[PDB]
Amino acid sequence: VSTLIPPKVVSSKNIGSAPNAKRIANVVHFYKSLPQGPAPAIKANTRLARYKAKYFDGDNASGKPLWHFALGIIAFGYSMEYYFH
Amino acid sequence: LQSTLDNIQSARPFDELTVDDLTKIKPEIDAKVEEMVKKGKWDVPGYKDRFGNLNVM
Amino acid sequence: NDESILLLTFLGFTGLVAKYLAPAYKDFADARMKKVSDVLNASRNKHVEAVK
Amino acid sequence: MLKRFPTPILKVYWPFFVAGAAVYYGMSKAADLSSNT
Amino acid sequence: FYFMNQLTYGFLLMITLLILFSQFFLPMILRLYVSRLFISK
């Protein structure tokens, strides 16, 4: 004889179907993350890492590193050809 | 929900977001990679429809 | 020298690339960066509106 | 950064490995027979 | 017909491509794509 109780029965009722499914996905995606640009890790110098933080950086990454690599390759090849040819 | 909105809009920029952060936040993406690598389907529907395919050639 | 003309020609194509291919490819690449950025912000907007 | 992922190593490329073994055998047998050098 | 350093070394190197790339690079390109997919839903 008791009336229905919508706001009293919300323990099992969630927000539709998709919103409750994505609530767990969105609650923790924003929890454990850097606030703003933390840990840049820019500093690196290990020849390969020296190239990474010197010319191979993605801020520009223009053809200048490629031209420098080609210049070094042809400089080595000149001596190689002198040895061979 | 209020905390979720606050930390969604107040911080966490996306352009500088790293993939490792996403992997450490949620590991089910790794399981998805396992499951579509083992089944050998690299073109599951819903990959680049909302993103840029840029099929130049 | 045969090896003199080759290095000058390679400098020539590097200059030509930087003059023509580099700008157009730069615009295309930056447009794709921008598209990825706006779809990321659209995903954020969808998330925050759904939470709202 | 670097991820070692479990991917098919020979489940799909095994005929390619048999072809590589065959070409190794051909190169080895032709190093003195068909070399003519 | 000398092919010891032209055939064997190149063949082994292309095994290195076929294995290492398909284990690391195309997988993490697809990882980028699927992470973008996941954040986009």
PDB file of all heavy atoms in Angstrom, chain A residues 15 24-38, chain B residues 1 3-4 7-8 11-14 16-17 21 24-26 28, unseen atoms left out:
ATOM      1  N   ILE A  15      22.628   7.313 -13.354  1.00  0.00           N
ATOM      2  CA  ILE A  15      22.343   8.319 -14.369  1.00  0.00           C
ATOM      3  C   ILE A  15      22.281   7.644 -15.732  1.00  0.00           C
ATOM      4  O   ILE A  15      23.302   7.505 -16.414  1.00  0.00           O
ATOM      5  CB  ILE A  15      23.398   9.441 -14.356  1.00  0.00           C
ATOM      6  CG1 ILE A  15      23.826   9.754 -12.921  1.00  0.00           C
ATOM      7  CG2 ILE A  15      22.858  10.687 -15.040  1.00  0.00           C
ATOM      8  CD1 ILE A  15      25.045  10.643 -12.830  1.00  0.00           C
ATOM      9  N   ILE A  24      33.263   6.360 -14.339  1.00  0.00           N
ATOM     10  CA  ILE A  24      34.511   5.779 -13.852  1.00  0.00           C
ATOM     11  C   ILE A  24      35.661   6.133 -14.787  1.00  0.00           C
ATOM     12  O   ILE A  24      36.790   6.380 -14.345  1.00  0.00           O
ATOM     13  CB  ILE A  24      34.360   4.254 -13.679  1.00  0.00           C
ATOM     14  CG1 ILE A  24      35.723   3.595 -13.449  1.00  0.00           C
ATOM     15  CG2 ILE A  24      33.660   3.641 -14.881  1.00  0.00           C
ATOM     16  CD1 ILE A  24      35.647   2.103 -13.211  1.00  0.00           C
ATOM     17  N   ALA A  25      35.391   6.171 -16.094  1.00  0.00           N
ATOM     18  CA  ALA A  25      36.431   6.525 -17.054  1.00  0.00           C
ATOM     19  C   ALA A  25      36.897   7.965 -16.869  1.00  0.00           C
ATOM     20  O   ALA A  25      38.100   8.244 -16.920  1.00  0.00           O
ATOM     21  CB  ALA A  25      35.928   6.302 -18.479  1.00  0.00           C
ATOM     22  N   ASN A  26      35.963   8.895 -16.653  1.00  0.00           N
ATOM     23  CA  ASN A  26      36.337  10.303 -16.589  1.00  0.00           C
ATOM     24  C   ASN A  26      36.794  10.749 -15.205  1.00  0.00           C
ATOM     25  O   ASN A  26      37.486  11.768 -15.102  1.00  0.00           O
ATOM     26  CB  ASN A  26      35.178  11.191 -17.057  1.00  0.00           C
ATOM     27  CG  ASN A  26      33.903  10.966 -16.265  1.00  0.00           C
ATOM     28  OD1 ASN A  26      33.872  11.135 -15.045  1.00  0.00           O
ATOM     29  ND2 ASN A  26      32.836  10.598 -16.962  1.00  0.00           N
ATOM     30  N   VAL A  27      36.430  10.027 -14.143  1.00  0.00           N
ATOM     31  CA  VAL A  27      36.794  10.474 -12.801  1.00  0.00           C
ATOM     32  C   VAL A  27      38.294  10.322 -12.565  1.00  0.00           C
ATOM     33  O   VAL A  27      38.926  11.182 -11.939  1.00  0.00           O
ATOM     34  CB  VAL A  27      35.966   9.728 -11.733  1.00  0.00           C
ATOM     35  CG1 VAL A  27      36.222   8.230 -11.780  1.00  0.00           C
ATOM     36  CG2 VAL A  27      36.268  10.278 -10.350  1.00  0.00           C
ATOM     37  N   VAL A  28      38.893   9.238 -13.067  1.00  0.00           N
ATOM     38  CA  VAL A  28      40.303   8.957 -12.813  1.00  0.00           C
ATOM     39  C   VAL A  28      41.220   9.460 -13.921  1.00  0.00           C
ATOM     40  O   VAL A  28      42.442   9.516 -13.714  1.00  0.00           O
ATOM     41  CB  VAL A  28      40.540   7.448 -12.593  1.00  0.00           C
ATOM     42  CG1 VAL A  28      39.687   6.940 -11.440  1.00  0.00           C
ATOM     43  CG2 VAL A  28      40.243   6.673 -13.865  1.00  0.00           C
ATOM     44  N   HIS A  29      40.677   9.821 -15.086  1.00  0.00           N
ATOM     45  CA  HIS A  29      41.516  10.353 -16.153  1.00  0.00           C
ATOM     46  C   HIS A  29      42.092  11.716 -15.791  1.00  0.00           C
ATOM     47  O   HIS A  29      43.176  12.075 -16.264  1.00  0.00           O
ATOM     48  CB  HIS A  29      40.722  10.440 -17.456  1.00  0.00           C
ATOM     49  CG  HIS A  29      40.884   9.245 -18.344  1.00  0.00           C
ATOM     50  ND1 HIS A  29      41.057   9.349 -19.707  1.00  0.00           N
ATOM     51  CD2 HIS A  29      40.905   7.921 -18.061  1.00  0.00           C
ATOM     52  CE1 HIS A  29      41.174   8.140 -20.227  1.00  0.00           C
ATOM     53  NE2 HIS A  29      41.084   7.256 -19.250  1.00  0.00           N
ATOM     54  N   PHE A  30      41.385  12.486 -14.968  1.00  0.00           N
ATOM     55  CA  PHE A  30      41.833  13.806 -14.550  1.00  0.00           C
ATOM     56  C   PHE A  30      42.454  13.811 -13.158  1.00  0.00           C
ATOM     57  O   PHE A  30      42.832  14.880 -12.670  1.00  0.00           O
ATOM     58  CB  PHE A  30      40.662  14.793 -14.594  1.00  0.00           C
ATOM     59  CG  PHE A  30      39.871  14.739 -15.871  1.00  0.00           C
ATOM     60  CD1 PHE A  30      38.486  14.720 -15.842  1.00  0.00           C
ATOM     61  CD2 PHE A  30      40.510  14.697 -17.098  1.00  0.00           C
ATOM     62  CE1 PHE A  30      37.753  14.666 -17.012  1.00  0.00           C
ATOM     63  CE2 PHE A  30      39.783  14.644 -18.274  1.00  0.00           C
ATOM     64  CZ  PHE A  30      38.403  14.629 -18.230  1.00  0.00           C
ATOM     65  N   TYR A  31      42.568  12.650 -12.511  1.00  0.00           N
ATOM     66  CA  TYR A  31      43.057  12.608 -11.137  1.00  0.00           C
ATOM     67  C   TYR A  31      44.582  12.640 -11.076  1.00  0.00           C
ATOM     68  O   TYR A  31      45.173  13.575 -10.527  1.00  0.00           O
ATOM     69  CB  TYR A  31      42.522  11.358 -10.430  1.00  0.00           C
ATOM     70  CG  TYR A  31      41.220  11.575  -9.692  1.00  0.00           C
ATOM     71  CD1 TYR A  31      40.502  10.500  -9.184  1.00  0.00           C
ATOM     72  CD2 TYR A  31      40.712  12.852  -9.500  1.00  0.00           C
ATOM     73  CE1 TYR A  31      39.312  10.691  -8.507  1.00  0.00           C
ATOM     74  CE2 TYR A  31      39.522  13.053  -8.824  1.00  0.00           C
ATOM     75  CZ  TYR A  31      38.827  11.969  -8.331  1.00  0.00           C
ATOM     76  OH  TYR A  31      37.642  12.164  -7.658  1.00  0.00           O
ATOM     77  N   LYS A  32      45.235  11.622 -11.639  1.00  0.00           N
ATOM     78  CA  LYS A  32      46.687  11.474 -11.536  1.00  0.00           C
ATOM     79  C   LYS A  32      47.332  11.944 -12.837  1.00  0.00           C
ATOM     80  O   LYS A  32      47.755  11.154 -13.681  1.00  0.00           O
ATOM     81  CB  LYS A  32      47.056  10.030 -11.207  1.00  0.00           C
ATOM     82  CG  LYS A  32      46.188   8.988 -11.897  1.00  0.00           C
ATOM     83  CD  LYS A  32      46.027   7.747 -11.035  1.00  0.00           C
ATOM     84  CE  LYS A  32      45.259   6.661 -11.770  1.00  0.00           C
ATOM     85  NZ  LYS A  32      43.801   6.956 -11.832  1.00  0.00           N
ATOM     86  N   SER A  33      47.415  13.264 -12.990  1.00  0.00           N
ATOM     87  CA  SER A  33      48.059  13.849 -14.155  1.00  0.00           C
ATOM     88  C   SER A  33      48.756  15.137 -13.746  1.00  0.00           C
ATOM     89  O   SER A  33      48.439  15.740 -12.717  1.00  0.00           O
ATOM     90  CB  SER A  33      47.056  14.116 -15.284  1.00  0.00           C
ATOM     91  OG  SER A  33      47.475  15.206 -16.086  1.00  0.00           O
ATOM     92  N   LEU A  34      49.718  15.547 -14.567  1.00  0.00           N
ATOM     93  CA  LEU A  34      50.477  16.757 -14.288  1.00  0.00           C
ATOM     94  C   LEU A  34      49.568  17.983 -14.354  1.00  0.00           C
ATOM     95  O   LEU A  34      48.672  18.050 -15.203  1.00  0.00           O
ATOM     96  CB  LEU A  34      51.639  16.898 -15.276  1.00  0.00           C
ATOM     97  CG  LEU A  34      51.391  17.427 -16.694  1.00  0.00           C
ATOM     98  CD1 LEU A  34      52.709  17.582 -17.427  1.00  0.00           C
ATOM     99  CD2 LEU A  34      50.458  16.523 -17.483  1.00  0.00           C
ATOM    100  N   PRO A  35      49.754  18.958 -13.456  1.00  0.00           N
ATOM    101  CA  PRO A  35      48.880  20.141 -13.459  1.00  0.00           C
ATOM    102  C   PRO A  35      49.048  21.007 -14.698  1.00  0.00           C
ATOM    103  O   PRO A  35      48.069  21.280 -15.402  1.00  0.00           O
ATOM    104  CB  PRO A  35      49.299  20.897 -12.189  1.00  0.00           C
ATOM    105  CG  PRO A  35      50.135  19.935 -11.396  1.00  0.00           C
ATOM    106  CD  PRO A  35      50.758  19.009 -12.383  1.00  0.00           C
ATOM    107  N   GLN A  36      50.279  21.448 -14.976  1.00  0.00           N
ATOM    108  CA  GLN A  36      50.529  22.294 -16.142  1.00  0.00           C
ATOM    109  C   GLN A  36      52.009  22.180 -16.512  1.00  0.00           C
ATOM    110  O   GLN A  36      52.855  22.813 -15.876  1.00  0.00           O
ATOM    111  CB  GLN A  36      50.135  23.736 -15.866  1.00  0.00           C
ATOM    112  N   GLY A  37      52.300  21.381 -17.536  1.00  0.00           N
ATOM    113  CA  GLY A  37      53.625  21.309 -18.110  1.00  0.00           C
ATOM    114  C   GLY A  37      54.699  20.849 -17.146  1.00  0.00           C
ATOM    115  O   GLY A  37      55.883  21.165 -17.306  1.00  0.00           O
ATOM    116  N   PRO A  38      54.309  20.097 -16.119  1.00  0.00           N
ATOM    117  CA  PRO A  38      55.303  19.586 -15.170  1.00  0.00           C
ATOM    118  C   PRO A  38      56.228  18.565 -15.817  1.00  0.00           C
ATOM    119  O   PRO A  38      55.853  17.857 -16.753  1.00  0.00           O
ATOM    120  CB  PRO A  38      54.447  18.942 -14.073  1.00  0.00           C
TER     121      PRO A  38
ATOM    122  N   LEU B   1      31.347  14.674  -8.706  1.00  0.00           N
ATOM    123  CA  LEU B   1      31.154  15.327  -9.997  1.00  0.00           C
ATOM    124  C   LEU B   1      31.752  16.729 -10.005  1.00  0.00           C
ATOM    125  O   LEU B   1      32.347  17.155 -11.005  1.00  0.00           O
ATOM    126  CB  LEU B   1      29.666  15.376 -10.341  1.00  0.00           C
ATOM    127  CG  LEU B   1      28.982  14.059 -10.711  1.00  0.00           C
ATOM    128  CD1 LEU B   1      27.511  14.101 -10.331  1.00  0.00           C
ATOM    129  CD2 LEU B   1      29.148  13.769 -12.193  1.00  0.00           C
ATOM    130  N   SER B   3      34.312  17.762  -8.198  1.00  0.00           N
ATOM    131  CA  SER B   3      35.761  17.592  -8.274  1.00  0.00           C
ATOM    132  C   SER B   3      36.197  17.212  -9.684  1.00  0.00           C
ATOM    133  O   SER B   3      37.236  17.680 -10.168  1.00  0.00           O
ATOM    134  CB  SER B   3      36.219  16.536  -7.267  1.00  0.00           C
ATOM    135  OG  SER B   3      36.274  15.253  -7.863  1.00  0.00           O
ATOM    136  N   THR B   4      35.422  16.354 -10.352  1.00  0.00           N
ATOM    137  CA  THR B   4      35.746  15.965 -11.720  1.00  0.00           C
ATOM    138  C   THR B   4      35.729  17.172 -12.649  1.00  0.00           C
ATOM    139  O   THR B   4      36.654  17.370 -13.446  1.00  0.00           O
ATOM    140  CB  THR B   4      34.767  14.897 -12.209  1.00  0.00           C
ATOM    141  OG1 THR B   4      34.751  13.801 -11.286  1.00  0.00           O
ATOM    142  CG2 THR B   4      35.176  14.388 -13.584  1.00  0.00           C
ATOM    143  N   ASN B   7      38.887  19.540 -11.721  1.00  0.00           N
ATOM    144  CA  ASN B   7      40.182  19.103 -12.226  1.00  0.00           C
ATOM    145  C   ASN B   7      40.168  18.821 -13.724  1.00  0.00           C
ATOM    146  O   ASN B   7      41.236  18.606 -14.306  1.00  0.00           O
ATOM    147  CB  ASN B   7      40.689  17.875 -11.452  1.00  0.00           C
ATOM    148  CG  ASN B   7      39.734  16.696 -11.503  1.00  0.00           C
ATOM    149  OD1 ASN B   7      38.941  16.555 -12.428  1.00  0.00           O
ATOM    150  ND2 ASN B   7      39.811  15.839 -10.492  1.00  0.00           N
ATOM    151  N   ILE B   8      38.995  18.818 -14.361  1.00  0.00           N
ATOM    152  CA  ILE B   8      38.947  18.726 -15.815  1.00  0.00           C
ATOM    153  C   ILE B   8      39.222  20.086 -16.445  1.00  0.00           C
ATOM    154  O   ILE B   8      39.979  20.194 -17.418  1.00  0.00           O
ATOM    155  CB  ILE B   8      37.590  18.160 -16.272  1.00  0.00           C
ATOM    156  N   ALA B  11      43.034  22.389 -14.894  1.00  0.00           N
ATOM    157  CA  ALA B  11      44.410  21.984 -15.159  1.00  0.00           C
ATOM    158  C   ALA B  11      44.398  20.906 -16.238  1.00  0.00           C
ATOM    159  O   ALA B  11      43.427  20.777 -16.993  1.00  0.00           O
ATOM    160  CB  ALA B  11      45.092  21.522 -13.860  1.00  0.00           C
ATOM    161  N   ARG B  12      45.488  20.139 -16.317  1.00  0.00           N
ATOM    162  CA  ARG B  12      45.653  19.025 -17.245  1.00  0.00           C
ATOM    163  C   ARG B  12      45.537  19.468 -18.699  1.00  0.00           C
ATOM    164  O   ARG B  12      44.553  19.131 -19.369  1.00  0.00           O
ATOM    165  CB  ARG B  12      44.630  17.925 -16.950  1.00  0.00           C
ATOM    166  CG  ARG B  12      44.932  17.096 -15.710  1.00  0.00           C
ATOM    167  CD  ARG B  12      44.315  17.701 -14.460  1.00  0.00           C
ATOM    168  NE  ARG B  12      44.554  16.874 -13.282  1.00  0.00           N
ATOM    169  CZ  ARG B  12      45.493  17.113 -12.376  1.00  0.00           C
ATOM    170  NH1 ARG B  12      46.306  18.151 -12.480  1.00  0.00           N
ATOM    171  NH2 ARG B  12      45.620  16.288 -11.341  1.00  0.00           N
ATOM    172  N   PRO B  13      46.502  20.223 -19.222  1.00  0.00           N
ATOM    173  CA  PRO B  13      46.491  20.539 -20.653  1.00  0.00           C
ATOM    174  C   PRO B  13      46.741  19.291 -21.486  1.00  0.00           C
ATOM    175  O   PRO B  13      47.422  18.355 -21.065  1.00  0.00           O
ATOM    176  CB  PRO B  13      47.629  21.553 -20.811  1.00  0.00           C
ATOM    177  CG  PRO B  13      48.534  21.301 -19.660  1.00  0.00           C
ATOM    178  CD  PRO B  13      47.717  20.712 -18.546  1.00  0.00           C
ATOM    179  N   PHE B  14      46.184  19.295 -22.694  1.00  0.00           N
ATOM    180  CA  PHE B  14      46.155  18.115 -23.553  1.00  0.00           C
ATOM    181  C   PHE B  14      47.191  18.130 -24.663  1.00  0.00           C
ATOM    182  O   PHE B  14      47.621  17.062 -25.105  1.00  0.00           O
ATOM    183  CB  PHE B  14      44.761  17.957 -24.167  1.00  0.00           C
ATOM    184  CG  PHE B  14      43.651  18.222 -23.200  1.00  0.00           C
ATOM    185  CD1 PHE B  14      42.754  19.251 -23.419  1.00  0.00           C
ATOM    186  CD2 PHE B  14      43.522  17.458 -22.052  1.00  0.00           C
ATOM    187  CE1 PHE B  14      41.739  19.501 -22.520  1.00  0.00           C
ATOM    188  CE2 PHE B  14      42.508  17.700 -21.153  1.00  0.00           C
ATOM    189  CZ  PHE B  14      41.619  18.724 -21.384  1.00  0.00           C
ATOM    190  N   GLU B  16      50.318  19.072 -24.491  1.00  0.00           N
ATOM    191  CA  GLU B  16      51.556  18.556 -23.924  1.00  0.00           C
ATOM    192  C   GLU B  16      51.365  17.247 -23.166  1.00  0.00           C
ATOM    193  O   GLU B  16      52.330  16.746 -22.577  1.00  0.00           O
ATOM    194  CB  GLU B  16      52.189  19.608 -23.006  1.00  0.00           C
ATOM    195  CG  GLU B  16      51.338  19.990 -21.806  1.00  0.00           C
ATOM    196  CD  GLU B  16      51.690  19.194 -20.568  1.00  0.00           C
ATOM    197  OE1 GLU B  16      52.896  18.982 -20.323  1.00  0.00           O
ATOM    198  OE2 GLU B  16      50.763  18.780 -19.842  1.00  0.00           O
ATOM    199  N   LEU B  17      50.156  16.690 -23.158  1.00  0.00           N
ATOM    200  CA  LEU B  17      49.928  15.392 -22.536  1.00  0.00           C
ATOM    201  C   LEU B  17      50.750  14.310 -23.224  1.00  0.00           C
ATOM    202  O   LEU B  17      50.846  14.266 -24.453  1.00  0.00           O
ATOM    203  CB  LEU B  17      48.445  15.023 -22.588  1.00  0.00           C
ATOM    204  CG  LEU B  17      47.585  15.253 -21.345  1.00  0.00           C
ATOM    205  CD1 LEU B  17      46.380  14.327 -21.355  1.00  0.00           C
ATOM    206  CD2 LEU B  17      48.401  15.051 -20.081  1.00  0.00           C
ATOM    207  N   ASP B  21      51.453   9.010 -19.592  1.00  0.00           N
ATOM    208  CA  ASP B  21      50.498   9.416 -18.566  1.00  0.00           C
ATOM    209  C   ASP B  21      49.167   8.695 -18.741  1.00  0.00           C
ATOM    210  O   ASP B  21      48.560   8.249 -17.761  1.00  0.00           O
ATOM    211  CB  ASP B  21      50.296  10.930 -18.604  1.00  0.00           C
ATOM    212  CG  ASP B  21      49.936  11.505 -17.248  1.00  0.00           C
ATOM    213  OD1 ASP B  21      48.750  11.432 -16.867  1.00  0.00           O
ATOM    214  OD2 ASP B  21      50.840  12.030 -16.565  1.00  0.00           O
ATOM    215  N   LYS B  24      49.656   5.003 -17.648  1.00  0.00           N
ATOM    216  CA  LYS B  24      49.722   4.819 -16.202  1.00  0.00           C
ATOM    217  C   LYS B  24      48.395   5.154 -15.530  1.00  0.00           C
ATOM    218  O   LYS B  24      48.083   4.595 -14.472  1.00  0.00           O
ATOM    219  CB  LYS B  24      50.856   5.658 -15.609  1.00  0.00           C
ATOM    220  CG  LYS B  24      50.626   7.158 -15.641  1.00  0.00           C
ATOM    221  CD  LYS B  24      51.394   7.861 -14.534  1.00  0.00           C
ATOM    222  CE  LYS B  24      51.029   9.335 -14.458  1.00  0.00           C
ATOM    223  NZ  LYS B  24      49.555   9.542 -14.431  1.00  0.00           N
ATOM    224  N   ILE B  25      47.609   6.058 -16.117  1.00  0.00           N
ATOM    225  CA  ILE B  25      46.300   6.380 -15.557  1.00  0.00           C
ATOM    226  C   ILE B  25      45.347   5.201 -15.719  1.00  0.00           C
ATOM    227  O   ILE B  25      44.662   4.798 -14.772  1.00  0.00           O
ATOM    228  CB  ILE B  25      45.738   7.656 -16.209  1.00  0.00           C
ATOM    229  CG1 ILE B  25      46.351   8.900 -15.566  1.00  0.00           C
ATOM    230  CG2 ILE B  25      44.221   7.697 -16.095  1.00  0.00           C
ATOM    231  CD1 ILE B  25      45.800  10.198 -16.108  1.00  0.00           C
ATOM    232  N   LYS B  26      45.297   4.625 -16.919  1.00  0.00           N
ATOM    233  CA  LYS B  26      44.393   3.519 -17.208  1.00  0.00           C
ATOM    234  C   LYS B  26      45.110   2.447 -18.021  1.00  0.00           C
ATOM    235  O   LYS B  26      45.654   2.740 -19.094  1.00  0.00           O
ATOM    236  CB  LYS B  26      43.156   4.017 -17.957  1.00  0.00           C
ATOM    237  CG  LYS B  26      42.187   4.816 -17.101  1.00  0.00           C
ATOM    238  CD  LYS B  26      41.018   3.958 -16.645  1.00  0.00           C
ATOM    239  CE  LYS B  26      39.691   4.665 -16.864  1.00  0.00           C
ATOM    240  NZ  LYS B  26      38.546   3.863 -16.354  1.00  0.00           N
ATOM    241  N   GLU B  28      43.671  -0.409 -19.323  1.00  0.00           N
ATOM    242  CA  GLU B  28      42.825  -1.195 -20.215  1.00  0.00           C
ATOM    243  C   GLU B  28      43.115  -0.919 -21.683  1.00  0.00           C
ATOM    244  O   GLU B  28      42.765  -1.743 -22.536  1.00  0.00           O
ATOM    245  CB  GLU B  28      41.345  -0.938 -19.919  1.00  0.00           C
ATOM    246  CG  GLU B  28      40.813   0.379 -20.456  1.00  0.00           C
ATOM    247  CD  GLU B  28      41.164   1.550 -19.566  1.00  0.00           C
ATOM    248  OE1 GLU B  28      41.535   1.313 -18.398  1.00  0.00           O
ATOM    249  OE2 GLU B  28      41.067   2.704 -20.034  1.00  0.00           O
TER     250      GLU B  28
END
